[PDB]
Design a protein around this ligand. Structure first.
Ligand code: 926
Ligand code: GLC
Length: 447
């Protein structure tokens, strides 16, 4: 139990969650106010996706999706249901970002994207078409409108120079026009949360929140227009992109941050930023385990003191490993093969120890996440006048989807924190591509 004291350092009492939930609600209120929006850690960026204005055009839309390591392009067919609209990916391609598309300028990257966009249309015998473009761009943006907004600053590792501070929809067309090959109506730009929330909404009208727990972690919700001070008008409702991943950036979380958190921060491409996300996101989960495993080896408590050449390099313990280790049936084969691949020869108890480290890190990720969701939901509840508020959350993300137990721990906690709420979780089917497209089909009955 010399180990079980090290890992206990991940535990969070319900009291700790309530504190975090209340602080989230607090920074969310600050982000929405004129006086404090500028230094707010939780920017609460308005998205200009508005309460059903009702004006949808059917037809085929192209959808981009930059935000992961695998940039995507797809075509989607929007139509007209009894509900509202139907949608469906019809054809689709994925392309790696090189690395010279990172390190260099943004234009390079958008030219690379432009290449792929064309490459897609080549291979689809459609290069001779003019389609409305939906763009899911999963980074923080200050929107002037549904189709104009600036990159506040890259997260999740992306480092492309000269992209910060600029019209992202600008840099895009900028590069689409340096092609001539094709013409695109870049109608609409959305965050992944919103994309997802929109597509879930068309499945379920109760969906007023969108959540992503994958490489990164973030959320978006339907706000009352009179509370979005950064937008003129008091009638209706606008979806607001919280950007809660940067909760803790003004120190809100210092009492919770562990050494493993401090070390992950310093070494990251975004030091001092996105602190909350760095407790949850799958860009960081495995790195936290690596770090936890290492302390255990220096304390001579695991791997019989010694450590692999690989275990000792940043980004070696992939998040998917956390996941696999937790799906091990007990026979340890699964834990062994990951560790052996890494260059280790664990024993029965090493395996068990690596298991415990994983569960400590992902259980905390889940709990910490549940507090933010509970923050958002309980805030919303203050604007709902009915004994039992029924809300629906749309969710996407590898960590949420693929990890053997996150979903379950996550739900139970969220529910403990949200009295008088009946919550529904719905997982977005292709909901990003469809999301950007469905948002386009509406903003197109405008441009
Ligand atoms: C998600 N939800 C639930 C209740 N109201 C909403 S917001 C919603 C629903 C359906 C379509 C749109 C939408 C898309 C693009 C521009 C716009 O103003 N609205 C916005
Ligand atoms: O990709 C999911 C999320 O992860 C990152 O935190 C981004 O800042 C954000 O904009 C996004 O919505």
């Amino acid at each position: 139990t010399l180990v079980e004291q090290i890992l206990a350092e991940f535990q969070l009492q319900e009291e700790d969650l309530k504190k975090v939930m209340r602080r989230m609600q607090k920074e969310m209120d600050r982000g929405l106010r004129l006086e404090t929006h500028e230094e707010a850690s939780v920017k609460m960026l308005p998205t200009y996706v508005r309460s059903t204005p009702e004006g949808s055009e059917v037809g085929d839309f192209l959808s981009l999706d930059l935000g992961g390591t695998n940039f995507r392009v797809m075509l989607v067919k929007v139509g007209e249901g009894e509900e509202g609209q139907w949608s469906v990916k019809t054809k689709h391609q994925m392309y790696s970002i090189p690395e010279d598309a990172m390190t260099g300028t943004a234009e390079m990257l958008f030219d690379y994207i432009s290449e792929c966009i064309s490459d897609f249309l080549d291979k689809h015998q459609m290069k001779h078409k003019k389609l409305p473009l939906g763009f899911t761009f999963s980074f923080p943006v200050r929107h002037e409108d549904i189709d104009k907004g600036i990159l506040l600053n890259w997260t999740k590792g992306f480092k492309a120079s000269g992209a910060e501070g600029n019209n992202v929809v600008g840099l895009l067309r900028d590069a689409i026009k340096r092609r001539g090959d094709f013409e695109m109506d870049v109608v609409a730009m959305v965050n992944d949360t919103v994309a997802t929330m929109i597509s879930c909404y068309y499945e379920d009208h109760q969906c007023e929140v969108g959540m992503i727990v994958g490489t990164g972690c973030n959320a978006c919700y339907m706000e009352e227009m009179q509370n979005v001070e950064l937008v003129e008008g008091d009638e209706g409702r606008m979806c607001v992109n919280t950007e809660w991943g940067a909760f803790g950036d003004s120190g809100e979380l210092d009492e919770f941050l562990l050494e493993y958190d401090r070390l992950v921060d310093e070494s990251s491409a975004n030091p001092g930023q996105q602190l909350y996300e760095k407790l949850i996101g799958g860009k960081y989960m495995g790195e936290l385990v690596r770090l936890v495993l290492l302390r255990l080896v220096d304390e001579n408590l695991l791997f019989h003191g010694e450590a692999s050449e690989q275990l000792r390099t940043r980004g070696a313990f992939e998040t998917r490993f956390v996941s696999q280790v937790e799906s091990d049936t007990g026979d340890r084969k699964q834990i062994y093969n990951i560790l052996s691949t890494l260059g280790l020869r664990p024993s029965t108890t090493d395996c068990d120890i690596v298991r415990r480290a994983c569960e400590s890190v992902s259980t905390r990720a889940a709990h910490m996440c549940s507090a933010g969701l509970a923050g958002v939901i309980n805030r919303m509840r203050e604007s709902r006048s009915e004994d039992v508020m029924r809300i629906t959350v749309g969710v996407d993300g590898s960590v949420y989807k693929l990890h053997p137990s996150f979903k379950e721990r996550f739900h139970a906690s969220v529910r403990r924190l949200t009295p008088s709420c009946e919550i529904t979780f719905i997982e977005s089917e292709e909901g990003s591509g469809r999301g950007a497209a469905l948002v386009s089909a509406v903003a197109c009955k405008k441009a």
